[PDB]
Amino acid sequence: QFMEGPAAVHYQPASPPRDACVYSSCYSEENVWKLCEYIKNHDQYPLEECYAVFISNERKMIPIWKQQARPGDGPVIWDYHVVLLHVSSGGQSFIYDLDTVLPFPCLFDTYVEDAIKSDDDIHPQFRRKFRVICADSYLKNFASDRSHMKDSSGNWREPPPPYPCIETGDSKMNLNDFISMDPKVGWGAVYTLSEFTHRFGS
């Protein structure tokens, strides 16, 4: 037996339950935006403790395990995926992923261990990188006209969310600047898996 180091034991989720959250399949960038808006407008937690996390790589093909689109022990291969990260008062991080079969929310270490897994046995070009944007900066700067979800003739590949496109005074579309894992582009910080776990892990 071993005694571990506790606020995380009694952690109160920052979102409604999974089924009460604004959710559209294949718009995780918008699902997370809506979690940020909820936390902002409610009196439970400050946005300062929260981050939008874009997961992608240069080829825009990232394996993610424990995804509800593929129940089983195999991965979904996303072009990109977006989750919310909350750093609780004691220092324990929680991942909010409406698309995971893991708990909502999920302790950071379990999400990385079971959803992401080690980069080491994965062919390097499928490795996962993380763009971490303070949730306040995400609400201020994010814009999508959803043009990426329309085919050549302007038809929807997946049904759109049931509210108007998110836009700012600066942009109507900069989604590529968040999917990009190039530090020269967009807001926040771009981390390897190692840098991501070092920053937010216990």
Side-chain angles (χ1 to χ4, degrees):
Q1 309 182 260
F2 180 85
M3 289 178 63
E4 295 286 332
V9 169
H10 295 301
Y11 179 67
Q12 291 184 26
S15 63
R18 189 202 297 273
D19 288 357
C21 294
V22 180
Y23 173 84
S24 295
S25 172
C26 294
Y27 297 80
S28 65
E29 71 286 347
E30 288 201 31
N31 302 338
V32 165
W33 194 95
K34 283 286 165 185
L35 288 182
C36 293
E37 185 176 54
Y38 178 89
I39 294 167
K40 178 164 174 193
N41 296 338
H42 291 87
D43 57 343
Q44 180 182 24
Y45 297 117
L47 268 190
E48 285 60 42
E49 293 174 15
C50 307
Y51 304 87
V53 177
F54 279 72
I55 315 168
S56 196
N57 58 19
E58 176 147 26
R59 79 176 284 94
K60 294 192 290 163
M61 296 194 184
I62 50 156
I64 308 286
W65 285 264
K66 302 303 201 198
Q67 282 285 294
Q68 71 171 325
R70 277 186 180 167
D73 306 343
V76 166
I77 312 300
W78 286 120
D79 59 345
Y80 68 95
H81 189 49
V82 194
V83 302
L84 180 79
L85 172 70
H86 178 220
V87 177
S88 64
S89 66
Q92 181 61 60
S93 282
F94 288 91
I95 296 300
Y96 291 77
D97 185 4
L98 285 163
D99 284 299
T100 189
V101 308
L102 291 167
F104 185 84
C106 185
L107 284 155
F108 178 89
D109 54 10
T110 308
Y111 195 80
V112 168
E113 283 179 355
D114 294 350
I116 305 305
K117 301 179 144 214
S118 180
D119 269 344
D120 293 319
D121 197 59
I122 288 161
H123 168 77
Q125 291 173 307
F126 292 112
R127 282 179 179 172
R128 280 61 55 81
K129 292 182 164 189
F130 301 80
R131 185 184 286 278
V132 180
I133 314 99
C134 111
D136 173 69
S137 184
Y138 191 57
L139 287 187
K140 172 178 194 67
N141 296 298
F142 181 75
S144 175
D145 69 0
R146 299 170 183 157
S147 58
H148 69 297
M149 293 302 283
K150 293 171 185 190
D151 61 25
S152 35
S153 75
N155 306 130
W156 293 103
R157 291 207 190 84
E158 299 294 348
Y163 52 83
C165 286
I166 298 148
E167 59 176 76
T168 76
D170 284 317
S171 179
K172 297 176 187 304
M173 182 52 156
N174 55 17
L175 171 62
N176 279 339
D177 292 341
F178 290 83
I179 298 167
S180 171
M181 296 295 139
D182 187 339
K184 293 168 158 287
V185 160
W187 292 267
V190 174
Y191 298 115
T192 64
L193 179 52
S194 196
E195 292 164 346
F196 183 62
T197 64
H198 178 80
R199 173 66 189 75
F200 294 110
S202 58

